[PDB]
A paper describes a structure:
For this purpose, we constructed the S148I point mutant of the mRubyFT (here and after—mRubyFTS148I), which stabilizes the timer in its blue state over time. The crystal structure of mRubyFTS148I was elucidated using an X-ray crystallography method at 1.8 Å resolution. There is one protein molecule per asymmetric unit, and contact analysis revealed that the protein is a monomer in the crystal. The chromophore positioned on the central helix of the barrel is formed by 68LYG70 amino acids. The chromophore is covalently bound to the neighboring F67 and S71 residues. Its imidazolidinone moiety is restricted on one side by the carboxyl oxygen of T65 and is additionally fixed by hydrogen bonds with R72, R97 and E220. The chromophore has a clear electron density except for its phenolic moiety, where density is poor. In this conformation, the phenyl oxygen of the chromophore is directly hydrogen bound to the side chain of T163 as well as to E150 and T181 via a solvent water molecule. At the same time, the poor electron density of the phenyl moiety suggests that it could be flexible as the oxidation of the methine bridge did not occur. Moreover, compared to the parental protein mRuby (corresponding residue H148), in mRubyFTS148I, isoleucine is shifted 1.3 Å closer (distance between Cα-atoms of corresponding residues) to the chromophore. This shift in the orientation of the I148 side chain hampers the rotation of the phenolic moiety of the chromophore to a cis conformation and restricts it from being coplanar with the imidazolidinone moiety. The absorption/excitation/emission band maxima at 407/410/460 nm are within a 3 nm difference from the blue form of the mRubyFT timer, indicating that the S148I substitution practically did not affect the photophysical properties of the blue chromophore but blocked the transition into the red form.
Residue numbers in the entry: 4 to 67, 71 to 227
The structure:
Amino acid sequence: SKGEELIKENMRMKVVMEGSVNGHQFKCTGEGEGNPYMGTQTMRIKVIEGGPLPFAFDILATSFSRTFIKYPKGIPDFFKQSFPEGFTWERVTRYEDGGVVTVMQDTSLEDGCLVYHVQVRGVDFPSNGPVMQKKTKGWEPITEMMYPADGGLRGYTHMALKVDGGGHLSCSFVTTYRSKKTVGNIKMPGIHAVDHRLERLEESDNEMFVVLREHSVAKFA
């Protein structure tokens, strides 16, 4: 397909994120690379405005890349077929003890480089919770269930954010992935799972600089 010519064995990506959590404005930029067909990617993130953030970088880490999924033979790749136009995603994340995050993301391809704009709106995190107290130590591995939905995908995840001393902050994502393609055809997948391993490396003392690595692999349900 026309999508999986434009998506080379090695792709670069850059991201602008802007938003607020409990009324705190911030901007982050990031740039990285990976292998879309191995499901592997890494990106270097800076907080350029509102830093240091008075909340866990962990609530932003899942908003920084669905072109980099290893789709086994037998499961159509919605994301790679979307190009050259790309796709959007919108997500509601409801955290166990109050917090609600709204995300609208645009994915474009410009000059063979993937471009992400991310709009983030976090509210109602408890002032003394581990998110607003910066007492989180990253995510457990994720399985996202992908469901076909009127020519897009619906993504459903139950996730675990790790907190200081052990125990977890449970949260659920529902994500709507829509293609921006207006000229052309698509092969839709059926229901399938995507396993995601999202890790932090190389964080600065106050998470002003963060490297994320992700490994995303599709499988049968």
